[PDB]
């Protein structure tokens, strides 16, 4: 099947290689680039992962109450002949009345913008549980997933992003 | 099937974003006096498909006669979330003893270590199976595409270890020129 695949590429082609580096960029942002009063960045990747596969490019649309701090320290490395590849991940303040509540480092699963743009929405909502079934399974066997990332799977019917994402933040502090 | 996926995965992901902006790329790095001296870039992206799914990190690892010269500009773009995703690219000089016989942007269709991975240890035939679909389902995607517009070039083979990926390219690169 398609989100098999897509999932499987997402660990071995993503996930695998930055969640090893990822306590370390994030150690490095809080200790030198965060400024003094600003909250701790947390220590896991936030990956959304809407059921409806709207991937926008910025998640300031889909909840205000997100906001774009800062871009983590790079990492890169040399993959399939592109010298120095750069893997990026951007840093959000998560909003409670017009206040930082929570900062994590949030993005979407990528591969479910490939689902969307591809037959019917029942299908895709198919497709969408399986990739997350699937993505699941590898990083619950995988060494590399260390409670280092969380998937954020949720769909939209009046809903708030921001405090589905400060509810995941607030049970890892536990 | 998994393949199918891969090969939309990498139009929609890659291909669609950087392709439409890949010649103007190429053509402000030849602009530089000093570039083209060395030699002029070839205008196109040169897509390496190994249908055995073998990807190396390294392309002077896979035949020293390819030898990295430099990356080009680089291109960024907000993506899922992500503030300036890096699209990056590396520039190849193809010897022919010992000297330059051509300079183009080179590299392999990534997704295919996605395949390797999945069955290094299902099956060699089945990963030759999903191979050959992933090259036939993206040559489709592209001969379809207004964003491949003579800019992008698949190169398919099997190694028979007396082979040049060198003179493979070469061969795509004499053809197009
Ligand atoms: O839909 P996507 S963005 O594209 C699929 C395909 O398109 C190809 C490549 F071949 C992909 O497959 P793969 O390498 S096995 O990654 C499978 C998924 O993991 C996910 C992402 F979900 C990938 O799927 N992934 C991978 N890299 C990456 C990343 N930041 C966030 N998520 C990332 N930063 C590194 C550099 C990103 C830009 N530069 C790129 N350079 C070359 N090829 C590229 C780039 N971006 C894409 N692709």
């Known amino acids: 099947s398609v989100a098999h695949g897509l999932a499987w590429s997402y ?3 993503y996930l695998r290689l930055i969640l090893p580096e990822l306590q370390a960029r994030i ?5 030198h680039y965060n ?5 701790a960045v947390s220590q896991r990747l936030y990956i959304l992962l809407p059921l409806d596969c709207g991937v926008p490019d ?8 997100i906001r774009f701090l800062d871009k983590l320290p790079q990492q890169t ?18 909003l409670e009345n017009g206040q930082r509540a929570g900062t994590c480092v949030l993005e979407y699963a990528t591969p ?8 019917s929405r029942e ?8 990739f997350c079934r699937t993505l699941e399974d590898i990083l619950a066997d995988a060494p590399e997933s260390q409670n280092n990332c969380r998937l954020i799977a949720y769909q939209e ?16 502090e536990k």
């Open 157 to 172: 019917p009046s809903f708030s992003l921001s405090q589905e994402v400060l509810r995941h933040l607030r049970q890892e």
């Open 77 to 94: 490395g040399d993959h399939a002949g592109i010298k120095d590849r750069v893997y990026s991940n951007s840093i959000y303040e998560l």
């Open 123 to 130: 299908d895709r909502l198919e497709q969408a549980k399986l």
């Open 58 to 65: 910025n998640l300031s649309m889909a909840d205000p109450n």
């Open 112 to 119: 479910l913008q490939t689902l969307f743009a591809m037959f």
């Open 11 to 13: 660990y071995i082609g």
């Open 27 to 31: 150690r490095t942002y809080n200790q």
């Open 35 to 39: 400024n003094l009063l600003r909250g």
